[PDB]
Amino acid sequence: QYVRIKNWGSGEILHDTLHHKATSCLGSIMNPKSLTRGPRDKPTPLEELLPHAIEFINQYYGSFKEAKIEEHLARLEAVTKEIETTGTYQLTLDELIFATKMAWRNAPRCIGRIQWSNLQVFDARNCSTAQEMFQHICRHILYATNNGNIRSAITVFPQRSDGKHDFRLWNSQLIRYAGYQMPDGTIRGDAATLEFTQLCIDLGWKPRYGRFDVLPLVLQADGQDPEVFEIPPDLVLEVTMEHPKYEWFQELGLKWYALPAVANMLLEVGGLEFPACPFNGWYMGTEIGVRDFCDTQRYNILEEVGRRMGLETHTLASLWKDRAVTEINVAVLHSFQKQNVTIMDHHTASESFMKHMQNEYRARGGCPADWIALVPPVSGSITPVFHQEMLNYVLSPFYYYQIEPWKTHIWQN
Amino acid sequence: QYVRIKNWGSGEILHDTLHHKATSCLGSIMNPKSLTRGPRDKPTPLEELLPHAIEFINQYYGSFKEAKIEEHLARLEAVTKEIETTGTYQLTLDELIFATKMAWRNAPRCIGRIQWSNLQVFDARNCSTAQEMFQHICRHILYATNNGNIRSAITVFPQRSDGKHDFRLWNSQLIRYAGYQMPDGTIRGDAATLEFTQLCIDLGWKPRYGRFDVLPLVLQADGQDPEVFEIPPDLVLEVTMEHPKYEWFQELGLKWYALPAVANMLLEVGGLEFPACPFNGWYMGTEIGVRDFCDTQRYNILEEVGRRMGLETHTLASLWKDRAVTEINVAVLHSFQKQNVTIMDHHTASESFMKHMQNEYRARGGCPADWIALVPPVSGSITPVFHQEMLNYVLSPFYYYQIEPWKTHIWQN
Ligand code: HEM
Ligand code: HEM
Ligand SMILES: CCCCCCCCO[C@@H]1O[C@H](CO)[C@@H](O)[C@H](O)[C@H]1O
Ligand SMILES: CCCCCCCCO[C@@H]1O[C@H](CO)[C@@H](O)[C@H](O)[C@H]1O
Ligand SMILES: C[C@H](O)[C@H](O)C1=Nc2c(nc(N)[nH]c2=O)NC1
């Protein structure tokens, strides 16, 4: 019945039974179709909706310490009637709160899941215009940032009705820097955002040609054309990069935003789909220090830092790259701490996740996990997660990927 | 038809068609059953054998630049007759050589595959006793070691007949250190070899209770009980660990063997199975520096080195572990070079593999690859392999895992 997984570090064994509740190896693929919930042009067929809704209501009430069968039966009936008379249904605030946390709890690629129960939920299901979306997002950014003392939060916009009136954030993240192709051929800023930066420009946004220009929110409300909105600067908290030992580090003129917020995912719960539900947590050092600053396709500062440290940047076997990326990682952590901005190093995060995984098997017999995503981009086997065998599966509620909005959108004018 | 994979580093796209020729996500599991070819007590059914044999003969002749249809048809006929009259068949030396290289070429977890064509093949298919196995292995170790100038080689023992007369090396590797549970409760040597060390002791071997005691070869010939054989010390080349800057590093008294040799895998080719075919290449630095020296379940020297460097070994966020493992990696590389022993750092190995993958798609439309196994244990995203999307599939010829011999063996006395 159960699948056994071994922790080669501690030798411990765990029994997975949770995978039964799930829905060439292509595990290396970035955004596979199996994890992508696309568009629709017709309401969810009732045959599919009702069963999923019942399943979720049962899950909701089954999660209480003190069972409430009286209210449980009443809810099952009311949901049925609502679907019967309207073709869909509305979740209660508590059900939604429950759904967002469980969906987080069910995110296989998330290493910060020990925090699953601490989540502020902003109910924006009554939203209707792009301007209103913008206001909600600003309130979210402000709450979440909290002047460095980062707080996890999520904002839930209206659920998909027929698929023709979807609320969508065209941005990948709430805060992200622009990338510009310069006249001299060089790339300025975030090379990974070239295409999207151009889109913002095509829509009206004015390019400032800097290394760290915060991109605007491209908001789609009620299925209509996306509108551009500059994020008010006071809301964007940044951290200037300094090294605790190398004074020349600040001469690099690097910085990064403090708020990590996924803006384009879809929340599936009880047959319902929320195409717009931006959420955030706090940063894990290696995200900035390794991916943002060291990927060749991003800011690519590795060679510059190595040369500044006076390393043999011309001989790979010298391991100058290993020495460089570490000082950069140290810079990021040191900077976020000096400026009182929440952040967690990868070692502490890894240990934190192991503890979580342990709690999850103890509590529900499993923990969906994506090894490829969970193992940090540096010092892999130095972290306990590397030696932990994992099972990857899709539960419900769940946070799905969506097809790029500009690829399936039908323009008004 | 084809599957597309993206290299997020260079942006390059590749089309995989090779996967068509192959035979919850459990990709994180160490040794899955899908990659394990177990024991048998009866010959391979002819229905299965002939087709696999024909397929391989076609592959063999189809690999020549100058087609030789005259000899090809003759071989197809002869193999058929041999299976018809004997129940199995013998590969020609050239076919075996071809099979060992292709099987290597088909190893998804191997990062040194650009070297696939440089492989010495020792034909020991006429072997019959444990003593003879021992002699072949010694010759292999000696050839492969070549006083530091490591050469890749493989020794092919007799193929499985009915499964009752299998040739098997009970060892995981040809050269490996013993692990001892000491009287005071502490573990000496390689903690990962405790059980196997005890087995050698039970079979007659004398424990020397040192930190680096080379284990004996436990050889099983013609299906009979395994016999113990001490590896002649002159044949075991070792490297004393020194750091280019820290004089105190040699005070750690560390060392490692120079020869990485997998001893327990099974070679499948054209329906045939060779349960004993030890092979070797040369070491990749991180194997010793990171796994051997830094895994908690192995030599676990990380904290000692950190404290010697005067680091904040009591504060994870200081990233002392990242600084320590790097100096150890540097020590290993520096030591192997100073003592003129072949070795490759992980960065160079990664670039080497990317070039290989490129050559493989260009040549045959694919390259079976296991991301989890290919990405180095440190500085993951600093290497190009991390950003390469991969497809994992089983081709033929292939090197399979086998069930632990002590678990399925029937003792004589
Ligand atoms: C409290 C702090 C948190 C930390 C430190 C954390 C950290 C991370 C990291 C490092 C990743 C991988 C990012 C990447 O490389 O793509 C990730 C992914 C993810 N996290 Fe968390 N997380 C936290 C909170 C949250 C919250 C509040 C939610 C949702 C309510 C969440 C949902 C997810 C999801 C769905 C992914 C996958 C995103 C994708 O595949 O692109 N996380 N998180
Ligand atoms: C020329 C130098 C070579 C290098 C540097 C190299 C390196 C490696 C490394 C680092 C691994 C992973 C080891 C582990 O962590 O378990 C590996 C695995 C493997 N290599 Fe290579 N290799 C080389 C030659 C060979 C040769 C000559 C063969 C076979 C003829 C081969 C067959 C394999 C196989 C089958 C595996 C998988 C073993 C397992 O899953 O336990 N390699 N190699
Ligand atoms: C048509 C669908 C019928 C579903 C039957 C649901 C019966 C109620 O289900 C009950 O809910 C309680 C929570 O209050 C749980 O504690 C109980 O374990 C569970 O059996
Ligand atoms: C019963 C199985 C019949 C198999 C038919 C094999 C026909 C020969 O096969 C030929 O072998 C040549 C190599 O010499 C290749 O170059 C040719 O492309 C290939 O068609
Ligand atoms: C190709 C491969 O899927 C890609 O490089 C991966 N990206 C990521 C990863 N892990 C995380 N956390 N985030 C990533 O973006 N692992 C590897």
Ligand SMILES: C[C@H](O)[C@H](O)C1=Nc2c(nc(N)[nH]c2=O)NC1
């Ligand atoms: C649990 C997980 O499968 C295990 O930690 C893995 N071991 C290894 C690995 N990769 C290599 N090359 N060798 C290993 O032993 N990746 C991860």
